[PDB]
Design a protein around this nucleic acid. Structure first.
Lengths: 12, 49, 379, 263, 334, 121, 75, 422, 49
RNA sequence: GGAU
């Protein structure tokens, strides 16, 4: 995952 | 009436058509044995349509 | 060695060029965009804040920028120098939105409307001749700020006169309609749920007659349609399919804020409707319950901007959450262009986009205050 | 860089015609120097650009990249006529004396036109002229008997002979100005060049090399070699007093600048 | 289309080569009445396209030339099919070529002490390396950038060979452009360092120290910025001239540095201590400068059509030369 | 869709579509029927949300039988494209489940919405 | 295939076991069967082993004499 | 050239000489019926005996196989060695082998063909010399076990290097690996010649065309992105399509109806190429099944045309061809069916052709417009020309009825056309 | 044999290494070049060398 | 597009 805490990223 | 309005109406009038991608016709090989080839042209048209 | 079935063998033999020339081609190719960059507008005079809003002049070659610097920096865009004709600082008036306006009847009239997180709105006619709209005439409760607004044209049918109207967002589903010049409160439109965005489309009736319809959408995605020529009565109701957390709505293919008209006959109806949202889909509807023609799923963050080309062939959607979250879609094929943007294309955190009324310019502002310009060679 | 791509005063000097760019379309306008006009010709095609601009004694001749010449009446705000050369290369230079109108294209071809009759009289190409970015017509009597043509060096061509007469060694850079100050004395300059060389037509020797502080963009001559005004690229104007009277190289005597009150 | 050349191949297989002014070369297998292949834009259309193209007598190689100062070779390889080889023609393959600038060179420099190569820049925005020997060997120096159209054509450049093979050894200047690009002869590829004037002015002068380590950039606003070749980090700036600087040199000793500009003064410096040793004013502004390190003499091209020779050791004019009837375009020491 | 009972109304849909998005953000949501099936086996679900418009509807009608046996509230929503959208997927979702976590930051809203659901039931 | 077939197997079953007015036709199984079969065609079509490229070796070509007609005979 | 490289050519030239026992084992062990060990033990006489019986069975199914009994499957052929023959005789031998592969093209599913080919493999070593022709012919029997056996005993030419993976492999060549073979430019035109031979001989059969059609159709899909490459496909494939149209076989013509459509959607072409595309389609169009496929073809092509002249009238010659091969009643039936493909541009081009060329057909134009909804601009262009008809041609009940039809639908546009034109 | 302004150069086709160059520059630019064994005929103005 |  993005894991900025998870960044708000749409799962394509 | 002006020619650019005529052009913009040409632009309005055009409709979408489904583009052909790489994996549009791969399944044709799967059903390629013992098929009438007129029905093959029909199937190609369907996937194109 | 020394019809007609062999026609193909002959025409193939004659030419080694079989691609139809796109110079005659009038709508842009589906997947290839012929785009070339030009120098940024603000190099002459940089902005000290982000570019919250951007607007091209309907006819003159001018570009207007505004932001939290509180200045209306207007630039003469030529594509090679881009000098600053003038600016206008408004102390205590942060700029969230600004726009050009030209009276649809009196072409000589030019005005600038700019607003922010304040209970007043600035008008600048064309020393600076400026006007502050700060009276709502008893509807102060419904409105907390003028920050989000747009300007449209309303035709008074019983007199056949046409004038501008300033549209505002209320606290709870309210939309306040004000007179562009006098500032008088004319009508009000209300919806259920929190108002998130609204947009304007024009439906011509006959020679010299047109009606303005207000398109308003809730975050849940239910869309209302009000007729502003009939005291703002609802005329239609429908829902956006698969719509949740909606953020923006826009129409394209005809007259709008980005592509204003110069005379009544130029009023045209928009054939396209796009609905933005938090998760990043953009449902496109053919205005000609509905069903979306396509559900674009590229940008992975909240849609902060939606805009259609003056001819409605390109839909541009941007997100301020992340950098380079900017895409261009070919219409009606609904296919995103691949060649542009690239990894090396400088966009930053996109916050403002503007299309020139003619000439095929793309202008994009970012959080760093940089308005980068591009040319679409097809136009 | 400046917004005005090209500019030109009228021979009487009371009106200035300038071309700029609005969006992707070039617009040509005229303003009164002695003292606002909102009327501009707008070129409807982006690809069409103006390469050259002349006043005629109230119309202006504008050479296009399309390969044709537009005669534009400022008052009517419309193009009255278009002299179309058969060939499509951009016009590099063009000059006028009464009815005679001589042009050159990127194909290095001279052509002759008549304003009164609206016809292409003759067209020809001369050897030893690979490039020709400047054409000027010598003021001899009431007819044209020689042409002064320059791209890098300078050359003199005879109309009836169709052959070169003399060659003057020009600047390394392409020539930018080729005005004829007086008889047997003409000035020559180049882009990215700070000197202007005075050449004698009859003899062919450099009389003087006038020195400017910075690069020269435009040149104006007063009377008959009385004074020369040159607009520098840095934005300053240099005036040369009696340049035709150490002696080889002369510098500007008076310099003019414009600065706002703020600075 | 417009035919410019024709030629038959005499190696026993059935082709015609037609060249055109647009720069294309088409091969027609005229027994089979079919087109084999087309080579697109081999020669520039602006310079006449394909002026001449002929097959060698009895062999599959074809020579091509044009007005763009280039001569190419193409070879037709044997068929890849064991049968029906006439059908299966390999498309022609580039074999080897010579070329040069398409426009007159703007500046020239000697690559090495042995005098075996030449660095040439032209208005065509290309930097080329030419061999002087019978090999006639030449290349265009690659412009593909390092990652940390052609660049504008070069106005000035300096080269040193003390540190060839360790890092960048060449510097160039561009018109209407505010930083200097580095170039590496051994790699024949663009350098990874860019040197800016830091005073909002265009680059007018470029120079190097004999050790091959320092680079000196002269700005149009009168500032001198000194960078280091290996890391491309600015170390020193000197600010004496108010007008454009037209010449920078450091003596072979790396102790006394000389500068000149369009303000007409000549600046004498101590590079080690970074002090102003002296200032000399000339009657006319200076146009160009060349420094002789062995003798410590440098000549200056003045706008009064004179070459003024100065000695840095005592800081005086030693020789003045007259006779030129116009600008001095260039000059050098023996 | 007669088998779909009870079906949430337009207003009731809004807050349940509101909660799932927050639960989707906070890693408090499951997406898919079989996971919605499996979570009931663990008994770690506040309530299960299904789509009435799924074709065939029998695919998800098994969960109400599990939910009734386990005394787990459940509700039906008209549109599946909205649920998967609010769940935060690029595909339609016919069923979803929320994690039982008394330490969650959106606990009250989750408590608030179920209170409507057993009333719905 | 075990995972996708199991997923589709559950899909058909929840219709078979729990449909009030099921038609005894197996249609949902038939369309579900097609979807799995399409999966195997694309999955089986995938080639783990990398395809080799068509080798095109450049080759050194050496120059050879060729007899030519002489124009002196014409003169 | 290196001595090793020169020496390699010597080995290839003498690949079949059988200098010693070890080479002879490799040649003779190669078999299509039997394994290597049993193959080494078998005799030319034993192989010929089975092959002669096999050919007779093939002769019964098709008489043309009987000819090779006089030439290739003769008793004297046992004593015939190719190494001992001269250049002219070897060229003479090879072509006779080639024709046999062509006549066997539709029959490898039959077992006797496999037996008959064994004699050629064992006696003539076709797997070594005629390696291309054998392998081109068996391209569409790929999933059959026979093709796998061919790969094991055959040295792949340079153009078939992609099949080197599947030689002596448990899994047969996948469909995906094929596109790569035909994706190669050098192969397509190599394949073009072999197909060009079959059409000349009328030896093409359905399974050849249907396999042939897909792969080229697939090459288009894989490379839709690369516009430059698609441009280089046009000389080869549109030439192939022209040949198949030239064939009298209805199957070939429709196979060309398959090929040309996919390029049209993948890559838009010049209008002139398409009008030529119409003419060759209609020139040799005789079969009813080809008639139906062609009529869908012409409409789809006219959808791809996208330039000024998109809906302009067909030329005189093409208009006359289309009505002759497609009487107007047929296209009415084409328009009646609800599942009709989008053909508004073609009907607009056709409609304008009618007005310019035929006056009797105006009243049918009224019927066409009702059946199919044309686009706004298509409607106006028809109105634009119809206005000219009134000025030039005499007023007619049908002619005014077309106007009255435009009066009923979208009245104000008729004024706009009249306003711009008189 | 290639013309270079007022002079010509001879390159060996096998390696395109230059072999010979003109001893002196012609008074006028060369218009045509004809090569015959060891002799190359160069035409300039009204003189052929 | 970038590294390779």
């Amino acid at each position: 995952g993005s894991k900025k805490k998870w960044k708000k990223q749409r799962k394509r | 009436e002006d020619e650019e309005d005529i052009a913009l109406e040409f632009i309005n009038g055009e409709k979408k058509d489904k583009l052909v991608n790489m994996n549009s016709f791969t399944s044709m090989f799967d059903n390629i044995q013992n098929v009438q080839m007129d029905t093959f042209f029909d199937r190609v048209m369907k996937v194109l349509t | 060695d020394e019809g007609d079935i062999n026609a193909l063998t002959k025409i193939l033999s004659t030419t080694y060029n079989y691609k139809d020339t796109l110079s005659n081609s009038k709508l842009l190719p589906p997947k290839k965009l012929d785009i070339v960059r030009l120098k940024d507008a603000n190099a002459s005079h940089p902005s000290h804040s982000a570019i919250q809003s951007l607007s091209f002049h309907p006819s003159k070659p001018l570009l207007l920028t505004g932001g939290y610097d509180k200045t209306l920096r207007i630039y003469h865009i030529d594509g090679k120098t881009n000098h600053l004709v003038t600016s206008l600082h408004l102390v205590g008036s942060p700029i969230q939105t600004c726009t050009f306006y030209t009276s649809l009847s009196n072409q000589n009239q030019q005005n600038i409307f700019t607003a922010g997180r304040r209970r007043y709105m600035h008008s600048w006619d064309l020393t600076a001749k400026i006007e502050k709209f700060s009276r709502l005439y008893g509807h102060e409760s419904t409105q907390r700020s003028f920050e989000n607004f747009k300007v449209a044209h309303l035709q008074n049918s019983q007199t056949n006169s046409v004038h501008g109207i300033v549209l505002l967002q209320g606290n709870n589903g309210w939309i306040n309609i004000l007179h562009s010049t006098s500032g008088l409160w004319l009508m009000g439109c209300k919806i259920e749920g929190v108002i998130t965005d609204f947009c304007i489309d024009y439906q011509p009736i006959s020679r010299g007659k047109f009606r303005t319809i207000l398109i308003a959408v809730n975050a849940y995605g239910e869309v209302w349609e009000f007729d502003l020529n009939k005291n703002g009565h609802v005329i239609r109701r429908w829902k956006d399919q698969g719509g949740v957390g909606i953020t923006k709505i826009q129409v394209g293919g005809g007259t709008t804020t980005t592509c204003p008209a110069l005379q009544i006959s130029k009023i045209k109806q928009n054939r396209w409707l796009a609905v933005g949202s938090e998760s990043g889909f953009v449902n496109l509807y053919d205005r000609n319950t509905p069903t979306p023609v396509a559900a674009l799923d590229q940008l992975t963050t909240t849609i902060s901007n939606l805009q259609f080309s003056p001819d409605g062939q390109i839909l541009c959607m941007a997100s301020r959450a992340v950098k380079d979250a900017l895409r261009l879609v070919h219409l009606p094929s609904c296919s995103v262009f691949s060649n542009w943007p690239t990894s090396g294309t400088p966009l930053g955190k996109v916050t403002s986009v503007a299309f020139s009324p003619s000439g095929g310019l793309l202008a994009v502002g970012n959080e760093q205050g940089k308005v980068r310009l591009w040319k679409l060679n097809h136009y | 860089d400046s917004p005005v791509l090209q500019s030109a005063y009228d021979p009487s000097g009371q009106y200035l015609c300038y071309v700029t760019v609005a969006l992707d379309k070039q617009r040509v306008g005229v303003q009164p120097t002695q003292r606002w006009n909102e009327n501009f010709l707008y070129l409807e095609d982006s690809k069409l650009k103006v390469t050259c601009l002349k006043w005629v004694n109230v119309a202006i001749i504008l050479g296009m990249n399309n390969g044709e010449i537009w005669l534009y009446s400022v008052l009517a705000n419309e193009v009255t006529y278009k002299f179309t050369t058969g060939n499509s290369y951009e016009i590099k230079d063009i000059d006028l004396m009464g009815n005679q109108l001589w042009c050159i294209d990127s194909s290095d071809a001279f052509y002759q036109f008549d304003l009164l009759q609206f016809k292409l009289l003759q067209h020809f190409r001369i050897n030893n002229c690979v490039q020709l970015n400047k054409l000027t017509i010598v003021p001899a009597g009431d007819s044209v008997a020689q042409l002064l043509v320059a791209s890098h060096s300078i050359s003199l061509i005879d109309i009836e002979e169709k052959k070169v007469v003399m060659t003057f060694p020009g600047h390394v850079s392409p020539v930018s100005t080729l005005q004829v100050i007086t008889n047997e004395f003409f000035i020559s300059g180049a882009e990215g060049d700070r000197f202007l060389n005075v050449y004698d037509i009859h003899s062919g020797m450099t009389k003087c090399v006038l020195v400017a502080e910075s690069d020269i963009k435009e040149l104006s001559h007063s009377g008959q070699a009385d004074s020369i005004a040159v607009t520098t690229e840095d934005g300053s104007l240099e005036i040369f007093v009696d340049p035709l009277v150490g002696n080889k190289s002369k510098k500007s005597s008076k310099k003019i600048q414009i600065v706002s009150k703020d600075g | 289309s417009r035919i410019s050349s024709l030629s038959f191949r005499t190696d026993g297989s059935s082709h015609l080569s037609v060249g055109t002014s647009s720069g294309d070369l088409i091969f027609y297998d005229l027994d089979r009445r079919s087109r084999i292949h087309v080579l697109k834009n081999i020669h520039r259309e602006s310079y006449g396209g394909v002026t001449q193209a002929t097959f060698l007598n009895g062999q599959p190689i074809i020579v091509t030339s044009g007005g763009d100062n280039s001569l190419k070779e193409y070879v037709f390889d044997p068929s890849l099919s064991q049968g029906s080889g006439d059908v299966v023609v390999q498309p022609p393959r580039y074999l080897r070529s010579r070329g040069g600038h398409s426009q007159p060179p703007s500046y020239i420099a000697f690559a090495d002490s042995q005098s075996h190569f030449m660095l040439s820049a032209s208005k065509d925005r290309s930097l080329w390396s030419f061999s002087l020997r019978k090999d006639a060997q030449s290349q265009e120096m690659s412009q593909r950038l390092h990652k940390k159209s052609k660049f504008p054509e070069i106005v000035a450049l300096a080269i040193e060979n003390a540190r060839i093979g360790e890092w960048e050894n060449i510097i160039t200047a561009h018109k209407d452009e505010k930083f200097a690009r580095t170039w590496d002869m051994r790699n024949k590829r663009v350098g990874r360092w860019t040197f800016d004037t830091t005073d909002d002015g265009f680059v007018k002068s470029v120079a190097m120290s004999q050790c091959g380590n320092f680079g000196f950039i002269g700005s149009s606003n009168g500032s001198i910025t000194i960078y280091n070749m290996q890391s491309g980090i600015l170390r020193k700036k000197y600010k004496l001239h108010k007008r454009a600087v037209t010449g920078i040199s450091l003596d072979g000793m790396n102790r006394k540095m000389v500068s000149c500009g369009l303000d007409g003064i000549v600046g004498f410096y101590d590079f080690n201590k970074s002090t102003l040793l002296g200032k000399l004013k000339l009657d006319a502004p200076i146009t160009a400068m060349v420094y002789h390190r062995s003798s410590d003499l440098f000549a200056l091209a003045l706008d009064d059509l004179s070459i003024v020779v100065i000695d840095a050791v005592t800081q005086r004019v030693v020789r003045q030369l007259w006779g030129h009837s116009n600008r001095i375009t260039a000059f050098d020491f023996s | 869709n007669p088998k779909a009972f009870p079906l949430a109304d337009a207003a009731l849909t809004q807050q349940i579509l509101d909660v799932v998005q927050q639960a989707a953000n906070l890693r408090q949501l499951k997406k898919g029927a079989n996971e919605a099936t499996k979570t009931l086996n663990r008994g770690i679900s506040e309530f299960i949300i299904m789509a009435a418009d799924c074709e065939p509807i029998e695919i998800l009608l098994h969960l109400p039988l599990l939910c009734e046996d386990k005394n787990v509230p459940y509700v039906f929503v008209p549109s599946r494209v909205a649920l998967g959208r609010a769940c935060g997927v690029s595909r339609p979702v016919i069923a979803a489940s929320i994690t039982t976590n008394d330490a969650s930051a959106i606990k009250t809203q989750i408590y608030a919405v179920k209170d409507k659901i057993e009333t719905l039931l | 295939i075990a995972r996708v077939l199991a997923a589709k197997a559950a899909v058909s079953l929840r219709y078979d076991a729990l449909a009030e007015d099921r038609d005894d036709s197996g249609d949902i199984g038939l369309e579900s069967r097609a979807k799995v079969e399409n999966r195997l065609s694309q999955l089986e079509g995938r080639d783990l082993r990398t395809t080799p490229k068509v080798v095109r070796e450049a080759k050194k070509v050496e120059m050879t004499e060729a007899r030519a007609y002489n124009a002196d005979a014409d003169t | 050239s290196s001595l090793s490289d020169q020496l390699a050519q010597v080995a290839s030239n003498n690949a079949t000489v059988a200098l010693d026992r070890k080479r002879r084992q490799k040649l003779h062990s190669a078999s299509l019926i039997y394994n290597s060990k049993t193959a080494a033990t078998q005799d030319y006489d034993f192989i010929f005996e089975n092959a002669s019986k096999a050919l007779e069975e093939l002769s019964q199914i098709e008489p043309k196989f009987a000819i090779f009994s006089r030439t290739l499957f003769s008793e004297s052929s046992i004593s015939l060695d190719r190494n001992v023959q001269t250049k002219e005789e070897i060229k003479d031998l090879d072509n006779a082998i080639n024709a046999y592969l062509l006549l066997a093209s539709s029959k490898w599913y039959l077992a006797p063909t496999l037996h008959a080919t064994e004699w050629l493999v064992r006696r003539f070593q076709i797997h070594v010399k005629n390696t291309e022709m054998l392998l081109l012919s068996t391209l569409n029997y790929y999933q059959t076990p026979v093709f796998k056996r061919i790969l094991s005993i055959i040295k792949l030419p340079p153009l078939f290097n992609c099949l080197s993976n599947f030689v002596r492999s448990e899994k047969p060549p996948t469909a995906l690996t094929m596109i790569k073979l035909f994706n190669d430019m050098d192969f397509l035109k190599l394949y073009t010649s072999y197909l060009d031979q079959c059409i000349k001989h009328n030896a093409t059969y359905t399974n050849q065309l249907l396999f042939t059609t897909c792969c080229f159709i697939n090459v288009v899909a894989f490379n839709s992105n690369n516009d430059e490459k698609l441009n280089q496909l046009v000389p080869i494939l549109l030439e192939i399509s022209a040949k198949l149209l030239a064939s009298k076989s209805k199957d070939c013509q429709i196979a060309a109806h398959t090929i040309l459509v996919v390029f049209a959607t993948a890559l838009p072409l010049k209008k002139t190429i398409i009008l030529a595309a119409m003419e060759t389609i209609l020139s040799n169009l005789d079969a009813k099944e080809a008639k139906h496929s062609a009529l869908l073809t012409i409409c789809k092509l006219f959808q791809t045309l996208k330039g000024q002249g998109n809906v302009d009238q067909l030329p005189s010659k093409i208009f006359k061809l289309f009505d002759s091969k497609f009487d107007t009643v047929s296209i009415l039936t084409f328009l009646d069916k609800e599942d009709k493909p989008v053909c508004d541009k073609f009907i607009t081009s056709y409609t304008r052709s009618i007005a310019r060329y035929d006056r009797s057909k105006l009243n049918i134009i009224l019927s066409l417009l009702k059946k199919i909804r044309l686009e706004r601009y298509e409607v106006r262009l028809i109105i634009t020309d119809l206005i000219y008809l009134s000025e030039i041609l005499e007023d007619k009940s049908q002619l005014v009825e077309l106007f009255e039809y435009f009066i009923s639908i979208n009245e104000d546009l008729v004024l706009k056309c009249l306003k711009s034109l008189g | 044999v290639t013309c270079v302004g007022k002079t010509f150069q001879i390159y060996d086709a096998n390696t395109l290494h230059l072999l010979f160059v003109s001893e002196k520059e012609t008074p006028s630019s060369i218009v045509a070049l004809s090569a015959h064994f060891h002799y190359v005929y160069a035409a300039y103005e009204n003189k052929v060398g």
